[PDB]
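User: what does the whole thing look like in 3D?
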Amino acid sequence: APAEPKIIKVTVKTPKEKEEFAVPENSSVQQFKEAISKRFKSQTDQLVLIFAGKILKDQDTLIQHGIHDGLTVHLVIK
Amino acid sequence: APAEPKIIKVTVKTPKEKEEFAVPENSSVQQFKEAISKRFKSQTDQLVLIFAGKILKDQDTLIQHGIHDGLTVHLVIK
Amino acid sequence: MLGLGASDFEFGVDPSADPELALALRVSMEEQRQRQEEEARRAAAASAAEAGIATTGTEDSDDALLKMTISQQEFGRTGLPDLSSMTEEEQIAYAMQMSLQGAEFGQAESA
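Assistant: Here's the predicted 3D structure for the full assembly of 267 residues, as structure tokens:
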């Protein structure tokens, strides 16, 4: 399976708990937000991702930020 | 032609030069490395093949990668 | 005065007036550091293995001089990057890039 897009697992930490999500390394933040929103049953408009000391939004990309497998993201709902 | 095994000539390219080796299309990477290493007098321990944008190893086969008669390969010595 | 100056960092300390955000970012930075440490120690561990397998010498100073001399020469002769001068990974990457017929953009910070 020599596919360019490799699924990566990112540990999402939230005020409620932490959960690891698996998504394509070339996935977008919006896609990741959708996955997280489902697990936490939250909204992508209320939850904000944090990484590299900067807030990650839909305009941002996972790989663009250097978020690969075995990474730790900070989810902030508010 | 497809019926029964068939000898193919693979063109190996090395940082020193390139050469064509005739071997059955059912030749494995390990066998191919041995053939190239013999002519170049190198070792499979440092012999690494490249093709399809992916480094070919003894764990793969020539035909498995699509290597046939007239196909080219990028040999890299460590 | 510190008070008037920098506006007493009233909002230059807790983004959006939320100290939590500052802590989240700090932790995030720390998380990256932890990962970086693993990679840093990984290279050291691998390097140690190479040293053990290979012979042992105390010509570290001489090696540093070679790297500095070759580094300056490499830049000047960037137009002609000899494979021998470059590392096996660099040579391998070059072949891989050609295989993809121009892998990646090949440029940093598009402008």
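In plain terms: The beta strands of chain A are 7-13, 18-24, 47-51, 54-56, 71-77. Chain A touches chain C at residues 50-54, 70-74, 76, 78 (CB under 8 Å).
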